[PDB]
Ligand binder design. Structure first.
Ligand code: HEM
Length: 154
C-alpha cells in the first residue's frame, strides 16, 4: 500500500500529541494490550509475573520498555513508508529472538488505536483513525514480508 501525503499528515498530527507524554502513552497501551489479550504477556520474560493493572502501572521496567517501543514506532512512522532500514533489526529480533506472531502485532495495533481514540478524540476522528490504521497495516505487511525472508512468517 501507499499512503497519500494527506494520510501521513493525519498520522503525524496525532502522533505529535502522543509525543507530549511518551511514557504515559506507552503504559496505557501495554496495559490495554495485556488486559485485552493476556496471552501476549506470556511473551515477556521480564513482565509475565505481573498479576494486576495496579502492578503494571507501578512497574518502572514496563514504563521504560513502553518508551523504547513507542520511540521505535514513531521513528518508523516519521519515515512515511521509507522505513526499510528501520524495519530490518526489528523484524530480526521479533522473528528470531522473541517469536512474535503477526496476529500479536494486530493485537497491539488495536491497543494503539484504542488508546489514541480515548485520549485524543478531537485529533482522532474517523478519517485520522482510518489513516493510522492504514499506516499500521503497512507496517504489519512489511514486517510480515521480512519475517518470510528471515524464515519465520509467523
Ligand atoms: C509496534 C509494534 C512493536 C514495536 C515497534 C516493537 C519494538 C520493540 C523494541 C524497539 C524492543 C527492544 C529491542 C528489541 O528487542 O528489538 C522490543 C522488545 C520486545 N518486544 Fe516488541 N515491538 C512491537 C510489538 C511487540 C509485540 C506485540 C510483542 C509481544 C506480544 C513484542 C515482544 C517483545 C519482547 C518479548 C521484547 C523484549 C523485551 C524486554 O524484555 O526487554 N513486541 N520490541
Amino acid at each position: 500500500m501507499v499512503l497519500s501525503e494527506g494520510e501521513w499528515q493525519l498520522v503525524l498530527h496525532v502522533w505529535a500529541k502522543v509525543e507530549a507524554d511518551v511514557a504515559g502513552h506507552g503504559q496505557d497501551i501495554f496495559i490495554r494490550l495485556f488486559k485485552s489479550h493476556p496471552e501476549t504477556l506470556e511473551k515477556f520474560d521480564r513482565f509475565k509475573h505481573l498479576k494486576t493493572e495496579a502492578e503494571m502501572k507501578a512497574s518502572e521496567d514496563l514504563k521504560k520498555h513502553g518508551v523504547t517501543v513507542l520511540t521505535a514506532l514513531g521513528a518508523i512512522l516519521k519515515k512515511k513508508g521509507h522505513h526499510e532500514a528501520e524495519l530490518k533489526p526489528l523484524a530480526q529480533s521479533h522473528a528470531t529472538k522473541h517469536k512474535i506472531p503477526i496476529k500479536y502485532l494486530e493485537f497491539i495495533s488495536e491497543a494503539i488505536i484504542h488508546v489514541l481514540h480515548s485520549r485524543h478524540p478531537g485529533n482522532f476522528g474517523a478519517d485520522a483513525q482510518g489513516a493510522m490504521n492504514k499506516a499500521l497495516e503497512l507496517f504489519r505487511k512489511d514486517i510480515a514480508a521480512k519475517y518470510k525472508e528471515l524464515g519465520y512468517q509467523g
